């Protein structure tokens, strides 16, 4: 309620330290003037007083505006197939057969085999399919599926995009198998770690991926996950698993969990990001992207560089 207009004359001359909105910034200005004007100060306790002086400036650490680029764990997908093919194998495909053992990913929907591959890629596993007719294909322009335009009685947008993350997930699994790594089965997911000696000195690029800690050998591991809701991307999550002799994983849950706690205690952002990107660069097929094997001629190019973001705020140590 006190505007500067109605101040007293002798005080009108004097510059005033403002307390109106904040009572802390005013005391900040008072102390700033006090060391500026060299006001005598008995140091006294020298500990509580120092704590209060530090506390008042909470102010040493504030929002500062500088652009800061960020790296995510999302692998951008660069390309997709032309068509979503539903081949009518029907009796050519035996009912009591597993779709998981097929060379390329393939999910069975009704009487249609759903895959991104063409008709006769699968002769070796299914010899009965040599007499198939390509006019039975229910190929769909996948880009329309990503847009969401295509909806019909044959398949729904929710049920036509849920089959793309499944098939792409088995594509990642088969690709990671092609890289010849051992696996640590999870309760729900699957994560893949690289052997001891498979890499030169167990270190790719400039970053070690397998190292020693006492008698417990830790292995950096990742998992794959494709989801197409915001963007077409491949979610990758870092993981740490252990082996007693470098190859045989420890079956004890508590021991492994405690060990991961021990290493993660001292593994910061530049210790996780660099290892993750180095392992991804190992998984790369070229300098910019990698492909997953889902058919003889069709391939999905997933970029090896994680999706970058941009933030308007940064900080310093």
């Amino acid at each position: 309620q006190l505007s500067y207009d109605d101040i007293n004359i002798d005080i009108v001359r004097l510059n005033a330290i403002d307390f109106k909105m904040s009572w802390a910034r005013g005391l900040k200005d008072i102390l700033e003037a006090f060391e500026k004007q060299k006001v005598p100060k008995e140091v006294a306790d020298a500990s509580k007083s120092n704590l209060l002086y530090q506390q008042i400036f909470l102010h040493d650490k504030s929002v500062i505006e500088k652009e800061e680029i960020y790296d995510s764990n999302w692998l951008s997908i660069l390309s997709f197939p032309e068509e979503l093919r539903f081949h009518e194998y029907n009796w050519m495909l035996p009912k009591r057969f597993d779709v998981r053992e097929l060379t390329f990913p393939a999910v069975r929907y009704k009487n249609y085999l759903c895959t991104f591959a063409w008709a006769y890629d699968f002769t070796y596993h299914l010899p009965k399919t040599e007499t198939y007719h390509k006019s039975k294909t229910i190929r769909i322009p996948t880009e329309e599926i990503l847009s969401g335009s295509y909806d019909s009685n044959f398949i729904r947008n929710a049920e036509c995009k849920r089959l793309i993350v499944q098939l792409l997930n088995k594509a990642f699994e088969l690709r990671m198998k092609d890289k010849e790594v051992q696996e640590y089965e999870m309760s729900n997911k699957t994560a893949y770690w690289l052997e001891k000696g498979k890499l030169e000195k167990d270190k790719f690029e400039k970053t070690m991926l397998v190292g020693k800690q006492k008698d417990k050998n830790w292995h950096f591991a990742i998992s794959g996950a494709s989801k197409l809701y915001p963007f077409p991307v491949l979610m990758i999550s870092s993981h740490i698993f252990f082996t007693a002799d470098g190859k045989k994983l420890i079956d004890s849950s508590s021991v492994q969990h405690s060990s991961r706690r021990r290493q993660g205690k001292n593994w910061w952002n530049n210790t996780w990001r660099t290892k993750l990107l180095a392992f991804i660069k190992y998984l790369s097929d070229d300098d910019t992207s990698f492909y997953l094997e889902m058919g003889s001629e069709e391939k999905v190019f997933v970029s090896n560089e994680p999706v970058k973001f941009k933030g308007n705020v940064s900080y310093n140590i």
Binding site: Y4, D6, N8, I9, D10, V12, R13
Partner: protein, 101 residues
């Protein structure tokens, strides 16, 4: 209502000119306040000046001189005049007077 014309000046030296101008203006019926003439004794002089400037001073007259440039009193009364100028929204509130060649 504001119907007073305060005269800012240095009271020891510029008193002659201030008194003369005040007497001339009161001869013209313009109400004039001067610390040499219209200031009351035994009162808070700074507060009285503050009330006169904020409430009753219609116009502010500054006698600018080689002394009136750098004295604290003329500076404070000038600053309060500037505040009243801002509040009244009158761009011609302060009319300085230059007397020293």
């Amino acid at each position: 209502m504001r119907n007073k014309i305060f005269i800012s000046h240095a009271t020891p030296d510029d008193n002659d000119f201030t008194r003369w101008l005040a007497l001339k203006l009161i001869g013209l019926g313009y109400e004039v306040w001067c610390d040499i003439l219209f200031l009351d004794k035994g009162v808070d002089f700074w507060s009285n000046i503050e009330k006169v400037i904020r409430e009753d001073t219609c116009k502010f007259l500054l006698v600018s001189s080689s002394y009136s440039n750098q004295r604290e009193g003329v500076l404070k009364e000038l600053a309060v005049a500037a505040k009243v100028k801002k509040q009244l929204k009158d761009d011609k509130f302060i009319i300085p007077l230059a007397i020293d060649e």
